[PDB]
Amino acid sequence: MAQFFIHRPIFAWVIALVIMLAGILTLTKMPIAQYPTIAPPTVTIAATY
């Protein structure tokens, strides 16, 4: 496999470029936060007498 690409450098360049292209496209629509969603659910009940 390494031997396979030693002779097809253009093919390896294409693989690298495709990877990079996918990630550049991914970043444009990626959400940015401070932390991931981490708070657990909380349900509160209220009643009056």
Partner: protein, 48 residues
């Protein structure tokens, strides 16, 4: 649909260019050369 209308139209052209670049890359990998893929890309108008 009036609210939806605005977003739909603008994005379309960009995907064609994106597609064209990927087609070129896959062709270049297939032919082990950066040149020949042009001979293929040039036929695109013939279809349309």
């Amino acid at each position: 649909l009036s609210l939806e209308e605005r977003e739909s139209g603008a994005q379309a052209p960009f995907l064609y260019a994106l597609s064209l670049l990927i087609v070129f890359l896959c062709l270049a990998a297939l032919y082990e050369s950066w040149s020949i893929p042009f001979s293929v890309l040039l036929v695109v108008p013939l279809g349309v």
